[PDB]
Design a protein around this nucleic acid. Structure first.
Length: 225
RNA sequence: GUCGUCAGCUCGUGUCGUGAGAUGUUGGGUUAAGUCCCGCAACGAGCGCAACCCUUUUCCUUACUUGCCAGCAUUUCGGAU
């Protein structure tokens, strides 16, 4: 499930943000600047990505659960589809404040969503009249877009795989608080201090995020033990 | 009694701060209303608002006296009979 380097180049992982938006903590990876934007070399990307894939594969072999976090508009559909393929918990919409550090309260949310979903599955919704049907149905819609991804999830995850560390800094902080390891895609304008497995690469390209999520999901499925 | 029928007043877990505290309850529309809908380190609850109670406006069913009189008949022309 390794990515080689040519696939990374075709995806476009080598691009970064403009030089004036950089974070000086990525000097080791930034390599050079072809234009007014930085170019992240894939020579450091490939091995770190391979270690991340190996770690996730070992976690899947041990049967641990790896949560997926991407909330950008570009990466939302990709994380949704790939996490559905991999059968692991996912967070598509905005990170709720206290999803992990305040899991006890989110549990009740999962429970009443399941309850009202079973109500819709059975005939209680049918005997509920039309206007009651309608506000309970948008109750469905909002709660499902809010926490549908973590509905199967019943405990704290063993790893957190994140698309944009800056865009999802809150999740990284909660993971640091609870001690759970983080694998994340960091870019030139990003802070890598609280990421245990730091893979450097592009984050805006839909090809790049698709490649990353494909590698992650294929490793998780390839656990097979 | 009064502010005043004013729309406000609080609580638990989680975060930020050495701390008193803060957040949530703020931000944009809307409403008679913290009324409702969107966003957001917050996620969840109660008392308040509204409704449930009484009365009035249209119709139906049951009930036909001590109340009623459209049709019939008799009338001292008084539903008087």
């Amino acid at each position: 499930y390794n990515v080689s380097m040519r696939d990374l180049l075709q995806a476009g992982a080598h691009f970064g943000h403009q030089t004036r938006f950089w974070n000086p903590k990525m000097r080791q990876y930034i390599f050079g600047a072809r234009n007014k934007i930085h170019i992240i070399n894939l020579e450091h990307t490939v091995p770190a990505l391979n270690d991340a894939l190996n770690f996730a594969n070992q976690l899947a072999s041990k049967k641990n659960k790896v949560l997926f976090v991407g909330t950008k508009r570009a990466a939302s559909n990709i994380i949704r589809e790939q996490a559905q393929r991999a059968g692991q918990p996912y967070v598509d919409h905005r990170w709720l404040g206290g999803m992990l550090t305040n899991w006890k309260t989110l549990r009740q949310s999962i429970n009443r969503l399941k309850d009202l979903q079973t109500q819709s599955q059975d005939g209680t919704f049918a005997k509920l009249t039309k206007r009651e049907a309608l506000e309970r149905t948008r109750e469905m819609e909002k709660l499902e877009r809010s926490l549908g991804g973590v509905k199967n999830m019943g405990g704290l995850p063993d790893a957190l795989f994140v698309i944009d560390v800056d865009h999802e800094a809150i999740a990284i902080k909660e993971a640091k608080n609870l001690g759970i390891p983080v694998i994340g895609i960091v870019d030139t304008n990003s802070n890598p201090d609280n990421v245990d497995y730091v893979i450097p690469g592009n984050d805006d390209a839909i090809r790049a995020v698709t490649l990353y999520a494909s590698a992650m999901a294929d490793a998780i499925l390839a656990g097979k033990e």
